[PDB]
């Protein structure tokens, strides 16, 4: 059950991600999970936003570079809607731990979008611990409850394919997103590291190589 | 400040339409709002799933047939999912009253997405009451605080540059869903009613037709 | 409807009373309510803490001196706890709006507790203007639902009786708690204008001015 | 680190306490502590209402019969304020996991208090589960963070003796409730079983034993 999990992190809470960074390698890693901090590690690093976040899980999760993406803003909102526009990303809301477990069960999605400023106060890092814990143990698309499984899952595989067909092919809508906003979205040693080492689909390879 | 809001819920969160459009004609009506209910009202009526919401939503926000949309499911992270993937369709989450100010504030998007059963308990109709007035009150996009809001309204404008460079053309990619799906839902009363009445695209309208 | 509301804060949470002093003498001042700042400041004034907070929630609402307390700390337990365990002194926990308007209606206290730090974050303060909203907004003791009112009414009479009964006589009470904190307690120059100007109970005011 | 639970529950949340005794025994049974479910177990077992459940607590706290009681009502207040008048009883309020786990550290207290309504959806079992998690995993007392314990202890610490203060002596104050409630609070099978069994305070017990 073990999968590439990418963490990542825009400008107005970059603060934080030595903390989020943190406790994902604890939870996630102890569990078996192989993590990787490609977003923004510090508010000095390479600058981004959540329209990056979003552009950046596409090209991770569709060339297959990473199973799952973990990311967040303020709110969650800006970085969930920035993921959920690109085919292929399937980014739920993850506020407190059952979030997260009805999401794996019911939605059976590939990335999480948490909120790290608003409702996040003294003690909001054991709150971020737990998510994970939920997020990443056990199995994950089964319905909830068990038994209900299959309008859910009906329905999700519909999702998938409606997403891909409102959506121009990958490389194609890649090609007219502001080509700015794609070089500063694959921009830092982090992501390149990651994406490169594990990226299953030459084009999106060959894309983002023009790219740099 | 006034517009035309739809409220479209789904199978799964039917049996609570009658309060949540209670309560929406009751605090958005009262505030000057033209409220539709487009989506299901019962158990027993025309059937739709949360894949059917998202492609309900696109059609009435894109041909302008409405300003803003109010859904959600059990969790609202179908709902939420399935209208972010369309062009032209910017849906936040909306658990508690200070979300939607936030949101309307920060993302000025135009649509949000409710959780009717998680979380849902004894004395949930107040949080919806609650969450209109704070959705449908006062200004919208000032950025939160106000004196914030240039970076958070640039990316915000970006985001939909995203959303429309990503997706194929409106029709086209509606088109491209499995047809059943549309058919679906462009198919009550309710819909094809608040549709027809106020859709400003003619192209739309036509592809409407032509299912019907 | 109107009430006397004492607001009381104590050290942890110090450096906030500006902000909720400013939120509560909006909303509830602006709703016709005679809004009282006894607890800190601001954390170089006379220090407090959540001890301290129970003390004088009971001295001022057993003496009559006020209707309402709003108070908290950094998670609210310490302050509802300690304020609890006094006679006359029926203390919610307040969290989100409809909290406050479900303990109106329920329980029919005189205090509430918030929570100035945990769960406090980015955005905090428009939550505690939306509990004061509902706290001080309407009446109060309707139970909820209004039709089930009886039962909740006879039990909140009873919690009263209960409290009465294993407690000493208030001013015995206050007696046997160490002197220097009821000392600590009625220190500050803003508790003392609030209770002297407004005792209605002659026996406390002599123990309390016998104190100074 | 194990202990004596007492799980209690009242009339109106009676339904749930098969599912709560549940998630209780799978827990912390699992965990090595020894579970005691002393409340309603159902609609028509032995009437309480949230009054006697206070009432109880007191009883298998001070006679040292339990270590810890989980409780709750339809919101957790009436239970919570319930519990507090009593010395020796110093309840949280506990509506999500790290509530449990700040409770345990900061307050250290031997009581906790549930919704069981509101907030309670589809899915409410998985956040009861959660919260049994963090009560009873672990070290309690540390403060949080752990660097900061001192004050939290200090505090703590005089809680209890402000509330000893207050209160008459335990047995006193018990003989001052209406002695009809207290009858009713030691009347079931399962609370009789679990105070006889475990009562370390012979006068308590003989008191008891008196209204039998």
Redesign the interface.
């Known amino acids: 059950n073990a999968m590439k999990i990418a963490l990542m992190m825009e400008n107005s809470q970059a603060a934080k991600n030595a903390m989020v960074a943190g406790e994902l390698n604890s939870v996630a890693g102890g569990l078996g999970h192989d993590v990787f901090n490609v977003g923004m590690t510090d508010e000095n690093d390479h600058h981004l936003?959540?329209?990056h976040l979003?552009?950046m899980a596409s090209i991770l999760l569709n060339s297959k570079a990473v199973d799952f993406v973990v990311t967040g803003c303020?709110?969650?909102?800006?970085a969930?809607?920035?993921c959920?526009?690109?085919?292929g990303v399937?980014?739920?809301?993850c506020?407190?731990?059952?979030?997260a477990?009805?999401?794996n069960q019911?939605?059976n999605?590939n990335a999480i979008s948490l909120?790290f400023?608003?409702?996040?106060?003294?003690?909001?890092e054991?709150?971020v611990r737990?998510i994970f814990e939920?997020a990443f143990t056990g199995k994950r698309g089964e319905g909830?409850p068990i038994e209900r499984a299959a309008?859910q899952q009906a329905?999700?595989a519909?999702?998938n394919?409606?997403?891909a067909?409102?959506?121009?092919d990958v490389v194609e809508?890649?090609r007219?997103?502001?080509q700015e906003?794609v070089k500063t979205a694959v921009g830092s040693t982090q992501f390149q590291e990651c994406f490169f080492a594990h990226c299953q689909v030459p084009e999106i390879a060959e894309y983002v190589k023009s790219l740099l």
Do not use: R
């Not at 399937?90 to 809301?93: A, L, M, T």
């Not at 400023?117 to 909001?124: C, D, P, S, T």
């Open positions: 936003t959540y329209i979003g552009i303020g709110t969650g909102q800006g969930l809607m920035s959920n526009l690109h085919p399937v980014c739920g809301y506020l407190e731990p059952s979030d477990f009805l999401f019911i939605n999605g909120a400023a608003k409702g996040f106060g003294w003690a909001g054991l709150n737990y939920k909830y309008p329905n999700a519909i999702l394919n409606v997403k067909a409102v959506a121009k809508g890649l007219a997103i502001d906003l």
